Design a protein around this ligand. Structure first.
Ligand code: NA
Length: 156
C-alpha cells in the first residue's frame, strides 16, 4: 500500500534557482557527494519516465541505486523521482518516491515541501529506522543541491 510523509523546509535561495539545480542533479550530485561516483541514464531523454543508475560507494564497496524520473512541474517548481532498486530500497518496499515542491518565501528565498511516498509490498508499513533513512536521503539531497547553489549563485 501507500504511506505518505511530508516535511516543510525553507531556503534563502529563490525557488527558480533551486529548481534549475534540482533538474541538473545528475551533473551536481557526483561532484558534491563524495560517495556518489556517477549517474547514468539507462533509458529515456531525462524527462518523466527516464530510468537512471547511480553508482555509489557504501562502506568502501561499490553499489548501485536505480532511480526513475517521475514528474517535473516547472510552473509549480516541482521535481519528483523514485528509488526503484538497489541498496537505498528496503526489501519491504516496492519503491520510495521523493517529491520536492517549492514556492516563493519571504525576502527572496523559498518555502519547500519534501514528500516521501512508500509503496509497500503487503500491508507491511514503513518502520521507524527506514523512515529515518528515507528522510535523510530526501532532505540530504535537497540540502546538498542547495549548498551547491549557495556556492555557485550565478550558475542557476
Ligand atoms: Na562523488
Amino acid at each position: 500500500g501507500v504511506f505518505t510523509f511530508e516535511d516543510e523546509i525553507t531556503s534563502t535561495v529563490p525557488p527558480a534557482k533551486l529548481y534549475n539545480a534540482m533538474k541538473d542533479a545528475d551533473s551536481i550530485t557526483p561532484k558534491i557527494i563524495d560517495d556518489v561516483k556517477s549517474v547514468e541514464i539507462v533509458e529515456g531523454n531525462g524527462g518523466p519516465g527516464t530510468i537512471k543508475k547511480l553508482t555509489i560507494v557504501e562502506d568502501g564497496e561499490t553499489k548501485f541505486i536505480l532511480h526513475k524520473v517521475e514528474s517535473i512541474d516547472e510552473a509549480n517548481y516541482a521535481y519528483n523521482y523514485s528509488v526503484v532498486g538497489g541498496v537505498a530500497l528496503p526489501p519491504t518496499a516496492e519503491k520510495i518516491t521523493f517529491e520536492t515542491k517549492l514556492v516563493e518565501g519571504p525576502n527572496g528565498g523559498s518555502i519547500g515541501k519534501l514528500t516521501l511516498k512508500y509503496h509497500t509490498k503487503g500491508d507491511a508499513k514503513p518502520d521507524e529506522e527506514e523512515l529515518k533513512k528515507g528522510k535523510a536521503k530526501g532532505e540530504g539531497l535537497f540540502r546538498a543541491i542547495e549548498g551547491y547553489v549557495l556556492a555557485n549563485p550565478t550558475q542557476y
